[PDB]
Amino acid sequence: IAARDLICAQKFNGLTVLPPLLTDEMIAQYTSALLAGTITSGWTFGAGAALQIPFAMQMAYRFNGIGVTQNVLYENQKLIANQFNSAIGKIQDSLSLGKLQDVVNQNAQALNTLVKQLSSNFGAISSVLNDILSRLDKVEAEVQIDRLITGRLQSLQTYVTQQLIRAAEIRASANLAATKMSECVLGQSKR
Amino acid sequence: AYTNSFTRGVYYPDKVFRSSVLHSTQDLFLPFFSNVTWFHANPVLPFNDGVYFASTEKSNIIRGWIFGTTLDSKTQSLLIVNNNVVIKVCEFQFCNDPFLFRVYSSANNCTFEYVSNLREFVFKNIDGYFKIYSKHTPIDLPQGFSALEPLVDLPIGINITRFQTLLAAAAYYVGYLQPRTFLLKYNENGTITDAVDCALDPLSETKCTLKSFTVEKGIYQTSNFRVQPTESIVRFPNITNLCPFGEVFNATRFASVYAWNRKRISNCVADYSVLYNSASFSTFKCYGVSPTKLNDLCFTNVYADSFVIRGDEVRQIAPGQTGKIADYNYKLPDDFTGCVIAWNSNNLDSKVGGNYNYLYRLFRKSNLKPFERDISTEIYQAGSTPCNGVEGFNCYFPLQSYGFQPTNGVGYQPYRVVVLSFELLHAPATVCGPKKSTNLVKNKCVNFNFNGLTGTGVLTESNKKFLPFQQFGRDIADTTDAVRDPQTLEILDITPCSFGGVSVITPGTNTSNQVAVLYQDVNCTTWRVYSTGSNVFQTRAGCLIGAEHVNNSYECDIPIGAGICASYQSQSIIAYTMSLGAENSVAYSNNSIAIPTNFTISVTTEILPVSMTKTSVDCTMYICGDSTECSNLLLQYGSFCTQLNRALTGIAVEQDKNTQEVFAQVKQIYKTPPIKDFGGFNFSQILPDPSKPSKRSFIEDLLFNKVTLGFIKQYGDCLGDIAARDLICAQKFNGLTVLPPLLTDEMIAQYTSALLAGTITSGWTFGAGAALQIPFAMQMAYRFNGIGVTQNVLYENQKLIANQFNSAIGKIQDSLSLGKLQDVVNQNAQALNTLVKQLSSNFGAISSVLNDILSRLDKVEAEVQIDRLITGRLQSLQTYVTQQLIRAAEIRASANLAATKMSECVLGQSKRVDFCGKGYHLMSFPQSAPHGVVFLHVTYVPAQEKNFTTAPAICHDGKAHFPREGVFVSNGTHWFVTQRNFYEPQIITTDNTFVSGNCDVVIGIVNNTV
Amino acid sequence: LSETKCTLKSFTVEKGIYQTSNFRVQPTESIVRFPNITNLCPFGEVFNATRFASVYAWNRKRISNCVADYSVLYNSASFSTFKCYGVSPTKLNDLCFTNVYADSFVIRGDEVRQIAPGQTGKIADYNYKLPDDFTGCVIAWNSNNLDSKVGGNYNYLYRLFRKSNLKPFERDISTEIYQAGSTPCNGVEGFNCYFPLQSYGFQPTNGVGYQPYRVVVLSFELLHAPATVCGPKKSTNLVKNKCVNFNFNGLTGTGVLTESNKKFLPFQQFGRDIADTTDAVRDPQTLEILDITPCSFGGVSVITPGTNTSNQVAVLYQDVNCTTWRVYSTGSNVFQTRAGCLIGAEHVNNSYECDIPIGAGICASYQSQSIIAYTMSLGAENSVAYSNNSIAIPTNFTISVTTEILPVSMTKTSVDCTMYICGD
Amino acid sequence: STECSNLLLQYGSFCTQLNRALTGIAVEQDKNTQEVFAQVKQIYKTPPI
Ligand SMILES: CCCCC/C=C\C/C=C\CCCCCCCC(=O)O
Ligand SMILES: CCCCC/C=C\C/C=C\CCCCCCCC(=O)O
Ligand SMILES: *[C@@H]1O[C@H](CO)[C@@H](O)[C@H](O)[C@H]1NC(C)=O
Ligand SMILES: *[C@@H]1O[C@H](CO)[C@@H](O)[C@H](O)[C@H]1NC(C)=O
Ligand SMILES: *[C@@H]1O[C@H](CO)[C@@H](O)[C@H](O)[C@H]1NC(C)=O
Ligand SMILES: *[C@@H]1O[C@H](CO)[C@@H](O)[C@H](O)[C@H]1NC(C)=O
Ligand SMILES: *[C@@H]1O[C@H](CO)[C@@H](O)[C@H](O)[C@H]1NC(C)=O
Ligand SMILES: *[C@@H]1O[C@H](CO)[C@@H](O)[C@H](O)[C@H]1NC(C)=O
Ligand SMILES: *[C@@H]1O[C@H](CO)[C@@H](O)[C@H](O)[C@H]1NC(C)=O
Ligand SMILES: *[C@@H]1O[C@H](CO)[C@@H](O)[C@H](O)[C@H]1NC(C)=O
Ligand SMILES: *[C@@H]1O[C@H](CO)[C@@H](O)[C@H](O)[C@H]1NC(C)=O
Ligand SMILES: *[C@@H]1O[C@H](CO)[C@@H](O)[C@H](O)[C@H]1NC(C)=O
Ligand SMILES: *[C@@H]1O[C@H](CO)[C@@H](O)[C@H](O)[C@H]1NC(C)=O
Ligand SMILES: *[C@@H]1O[C@H](CO)[C@@H](O)[C@H](O)[C@H]1NC(C)=O
Ligand SMILES: *[C@@H]1O[C@H](CO)[C@@H](O)[C@H](O)[C@H]1NC(C)=O
Ligand SMILES: *[C@@H]1O[C@H](CO)[C@@H](O)[C@H](O)[C@H]1NC(C)=O
Ligand SMILES: *[C@@H]1O[C@H](CO)[C@@H](O)[C@H](O)[C@H]1NC(C)=O
Ligand SMILES: *[C@@H]1O[C@H](CO)[C@@H](O)[C@H](O)[C@H]1NC(C)=O
């Protein structure tokens, strides 16, 4: 069963995956707290104590924010609510995400090619240590084992360098997402 | 009968002086915390790989030792005895009870002779050398750490498996040694004072990896779970006969070279030791295999080729030779695997008068191909004219005859030649060798040898169907994973027996010595662990052993994974689930609102790196030192140092650019105000202090002492032994240097003081051109208008606001008693230190010192080693440069963020949420720090809210009215209109209101009077 | 400037500052320090002995306190085999050797190929074996004139049967009968049992492959511990506080020798650092201990206005404090900064903007015409007339247009690896 | 293989380096998640009405 799993083929050769510290349920808990705060309090909770305010009055504030008078909202409340409900319905209808899948695909591909590069000779007489050691004595075997060692070390070094570059990219994206959460969800943006 | 050693038994591995260092070595050591045996006041004990001996005596009772295999007169034994120190190697005949001088009865021929309160000895036997280390120590085995020093090494050259003690009211101890890895500590004087056994505990593995005797609180990854092989297996086919050595090597008459003979070998056992008493070979050379492995292998397609040639043509039977025989008679491939055997036969093939029975080919149009035979007899044309049979002046008969007389020179004597060709380790094989098979063992980690293929692992029954011509099966990584048993013909799968990840959690060695272990691939709900215990907690990250579970939820202390953390509390380690935060709720309704009635002024600090250290490298000095030979060999890699230096120079200029674009935003320098009277606001703690050797403020001074880090280091400064501990001019004796920043710290402080003066005297006008003066209180009133509060609110609470600001700015300097800035320094130091440390690697050569290599080998033999060293060291430098580039990019991102923050938070008022602090931003002050910048953010925070009833609109007389600013609130009886961020009710009248409705459509309208 | 030109691989240089090689120093003279020994090594007793031992009971003797001048063998001894393993034959005259043993025996002509680290056969298996990590030399020569007698010399024996292979440098001198059929063999012989030892029959009229050969094996260690067997080199005086070339007991190198304060234990001769290079040594004659320091140290930089403007340059020595001789050349003007010592530029007292950055707040520029060094200026000095009842308000305005430039893309490339690496 | 394990010790300062880099990445990921999602330390209930 180890000859087809492709996961414990990785970890029979020393490659392992570590779990995240926060579980998906805890993340969903955080997002639910954010939604409850923004719906009940407006943008007050993002600056200290959360103050309650009726939702229609909050949307009137947000209309004053974009340069329209608040009586325009109160005279079209039902049309606005219907439009919002229909729009969210369309959003969930459409859902029947390649940016997120690309990261997973890249990580899997990197680990799999790392496993695959173990069949190279690197200039020796074979890529199997046991075959080399079954036929040659110590002095004649060091010369081949050293070539294999150098090849596999440079494989690992290449993998680590690529991982560092990808991590820097992901950090840039995470900083952008944090700023978006801070400025679009906890307040109204003018940019 | 049994005792415990703790840290007893350690010797100097080498004879080289070291001091102030930690060194890691592998040798045969007595394992830490092992059980030794106790003998009171003799028996015969084994001698496995070496012995640790100790004797606590008071009257010189222990006297000596005897070593050997059997202690009779059929083998040699070693006697060491005091009585005069006497050392002999003889064929002694010993007694059952030897005591001291009736120790032995006879002494046959000898090959070695030398007659000449806690005593510790170590004995070893390597390469015919009996090595002894010893030490004495004045005072139930005691405790402590002492290191034994080399005593003697004797060339006895005997085989030892047992030993015994010689006795004339004492005790002695016996422990056995195993190959281990130790981390020893040398002190200032060169004495070994401490050691760590790496293969004892996971904590010991962590200590050996960190190369330190202390560990800081955290969680560390250790080696994967390892399992040892229990036993060994041999499985060859069943064969009885012996290979036909007599028919090949003892044949009556051999063939001619031009018609060499070939025969196949199969179904036999290759036991060539039967040739030792009858055949001596002048040539025996093998190509694809070592001569010392032949007894362990099996061979697939075995052919033997025989012929006869003359004495000095034997050198032509080799893969790549030219000559008469190699060209026209017999050629070997370049990829030949086999053996060539030749021996002189002047007694059989020589006759008086001349033997003319052996021929060879002298003329041919073109060279043969490997293993091609040509037995033609057609005349040879050598003049480009017809050659129809007749001979002479153009035509020769191709074949010539050897003439072998008994009285020739050795170069013209007959030689018999055999060539054996075979294949190894790919297909089924019927010519095995003289090894004996054993039983087949399944479902255990064992050592196996299947038809010469050796390995380790677990064997299981398989379901694959090999074709008859296949014997092995390979995986995608090119390793064998299936095999066919050569006797039962069943097929087995081979699986490795090492699997699973392991981690160790520690609170710090300076706190406690207890640890927890996480097994990441185990479900205890279980035996794949080093040790079980009283408490075993199962998580979804693995199985944790050594920590107690609890049901309450704290914040995280040490992250373990999947929502579980650990901490240290009679005192134990506990595991819990991390809490996200407090549990709160909001009293929401459709006609209720809360409005603040008071406020607080808060000051918070933010820290950002701006720069890192600039370095340069002299590659010739790092790679070659000062060897002219190495310097001349390095020129064949010349296009690789300029590249590294270009990258480093780019980084070095980038750092100064970062500092310039963060701090030199204003080119006008504003002097500090001569009179400091700003509506009652105290700035003395952040303005420049002129009563110091610098112009740094109080807070800046507190900041600069909180980071531990430019200087001129002279040659005479660390000339001599002082270079062996500085750790800085150890770097720069190898070509690594640090360049100073272009702007000094005083200049940076000058820029920050100009910024503060501008912002305190001008507001935000100086960041857009000419700086215009304005009283500070009016500036604060403007900043209050900025966040949506009226300016009269500021003017009526000026004393309270000023007092709050002063107390808040005092709290910051109180608290200052910065790991983000220290991390950069630590990383930059560590990288260079490991670069210096990597110069002790061999990289595959015979030594890591150029001078040692060049003191013993000459040019041609020395290039082969110097080139390996050069490749390794170039790789080290390239790795360092790449990591530096990545870190520089990260620092550039941080510096750009700091520049934007200086431009938007300090030179103006920000509307972006949570960009210049927490709350509603008012204003910001920068301070300079080592390699970074610190921002003091001042924000407005509403407080002390109260409840009110609210309506969206008010209907007077059939018309709708809207507040036009703020909200309508009611305190139970009356209706007022107020502002959002501060309670300030007023009368609802026609100027604070506008009418744009008919009072028929607004939901929630409440009618009142205006 | 020439080093900069060679590094850039160009005959022109643009205005700026360039890093050059570190400050190098040449060694003045050479030193040799061996121990004091008078005697000559016993070549006659080993190579000229009347009778050697058998291969199964080979002989071994220790060599110490002598000088190895093997040129004395040229007059009398010709060798058919001489091979060395851990060292080159042309370096033997400059080295010292630590633990020297000589092992001697006699074998037949065609077995000499079996005295090597990884050989198989009768002698390598049952009689005499070498390690895989052997460091030493093997010497063999024909001796048909001494060990051959008419009718057959039967004094030399070897072992033909043994249960298992010998370990390296192991001797076996037993005489017990050998069991070859798995039946009791209590002394009697025949059809299952053999006496383990066989005898060479050496007659003068044999083939060269059946003639006697005398074999000596020398084993020693190099460059780790104290040594008493040295080559025929002559010592010189000890020189301190100068960069010299040294040869201490065969270990060669360069640097400065200084008196030390370390106490080696009697069994130690050298000392190492974390980098695994030798740092301390013990003089083999006075028994004092010296420290070895490299004599190359310090960074150097060159400031140039551009070769198309002028050929004159300034040099910054980054590890020198002229307030001074660790410089290539002195000059009329020398300026001391906290970045190093600058030689070839005139200091001035007025402050400009930066032109060429030097470090720690100092820049340089081209001024009859010379290079000048000053401290960069941060900008103009202004002030604000602040009071508690005053304000300034603009009365006019200006419209300004400014430019900003940003990169968006770079060039796209591809590679054919087979074409770059292997051509065709 | 014990032989390869004993031969690899002449390259011992190259595994710790790789592992340090990977550990840095691993902690960076958890930091990213915290700084994106755990912005508010107060947990608010979903409204009852
Ligand atoms: C009697 C023991 C002498 C050994 C002294 C110790 C080390 C000398 C090492 C190598 C020198 C080889 C000496 C044998 C003569 C070499 C052949 C020649 O003459 O060119
Ligand atoms: C005719 C039998 C063919 C040999 C069997 C096939 C393969 C065995 C390969 C090598 C071992 C035999 C080498 C000949 C003996 C020389 C070694 C010695 O005695 O010094
Ligand atoms: C050792 O002594 C025994 C007994 O006389 C003798 O047979 C044997 O040949 C001797 N061997 C050696 C090497 O001296
Ligand atoms: C070790 O060296 C120090 C100086 O480095 C010295 O003070 C101390 O006495 C020495 N220890 C001894 C001699 O035991
Ligand atoms: C060859 O045959 C002869 C005579 O039968 C025998 O004495 C000798 O030992 C044999 N040698 C080999 C190598 O078979
Ligand atoms: C094989 O035969 C062809 C034609 O008969 C000839 O040209 C060629 O030389 C031969 N090969 C060899 C190796 O002689
Ligand atoms: C070897 O013996 C076993 C019985 O122990 C038998 O099954 C097997 O067939 C024999 N060898 C081969 C190649 O079949
Ligand atoms: C562990 O084993 C138990 C018992 O079968 C099972 O319920 C559980 O799903 C397994 N996995 C974990 C993570 O506990
Ligand atoms: C607001 O808080 C301050 C304390 O900072 C207090 O002195 C003041 O009385 C409070 N105002 C009211 C109206 O309670
Ligand atoms: C400002 O604070 C300092 C620090 O305590 C204090 O000495 C000074 O008196 C304060 N300013 C005034 C005007 O009191
Ligand atoms: C407002 O009322 C809610 C419940 O109606 C209460 O929980 C809250 O504490 C009140 N506000 C204040 C400031 O007390
Ligand atoms: C509400 O306001 C009215 C009008 O100012 C006042 O008479 C009454 O006392 C207030 N009630 C409370 C609870 O403040
Ligand atoms: C307020 O509106 C209600 C609903 O039409 C009406 O009955 C009531 O009389 C109004 N109040 C006043 C004071 O006009
Ligand atoms: C061996 O001794 C003889 C006679 O004493 C002498 O002639 C010969 O030169 C010596 N050979 C050596 C010392 O190699
Ligand atoms: C050493 O002695 C033991 C027991 O006497 C024996 O089994 C082993 O074969 C001997 N070693 C050698 C290399 O003969
Ligand atoms: C060598 O001679 C010196 C005197 O020049 C003497 O001090 C020294 O002891 C001699 N050699 C040794 C090893 O002592
Ligand atoms: C250079 O030497 C002078 C003379 O002693 C000394 O005052 C100064 O501190 C040293 N360092 C620098 C950077 O000038
Ligand atoms: C303002 O500047 C313009 C020149 O751009 C000038 O023509 C105009 O007279 C100025 N206004 C006053 C009031 O001086």
Characterise the protein shown here.
The structure is cut from a larger assembly and holds four copies of chain A. Chain A is mainly alpha-helical and 191 residues long. Chain A is 68% helix and 0% strand. Chain A has helices at residues 8-11, 24-41, 55-65, 71-74, 77-94, 98-116, 129-135, 138-185. Chain A is rod-shaped. The relative contact order of chain A is 0.07. Chain B binds chain D through residues 24, 26, 209, 221, 559, 580-586, 588, 834, 837-838, 841-844, 879, 883, and chain D through 6, 9-14, 16-17, 19, 21, 23, 30, 38, 40-45, 47, 49. One 2-acetamido-2-deoxy-beta-D-glucopyranose (NAG) sits between chains B (69, 159, 161) and C (164, 166-167).
Attribute tags:
mainly alpha; binds 2-acetamido-2-deoxy-beta-D-glucopyranose; 8 helices; Spike protein S2' (chain A); 4 chains; binds linoleic acid
**Proportion in helices of chain A:** 55-70%
**Secondary-structure content class of chain A:** mainly alpha
What does the main sheet of chain A amount to? none
Number of helices of chain A: 8
H-E string of chain A: HHHHHHHH
Shape of chain A: rod-shaped
What is the oligomer described by this structure?
Answer: part of a larger assembly
Region (Receptor-binding motif) (chain C): 142-213
Region (Immunodominant HLA epitope recognized by the CD8+) (chain C): 153-161
Region (Integrin-binding motif) (chain C): 108-110
Region (Disordered) (chain C): 24-40, 160-195, 224-246
Please outline what is shown here.
The structure is cut from a larger assembly and holds four copies of chain A. The first copy, chain A, contains eight helices and no strands.
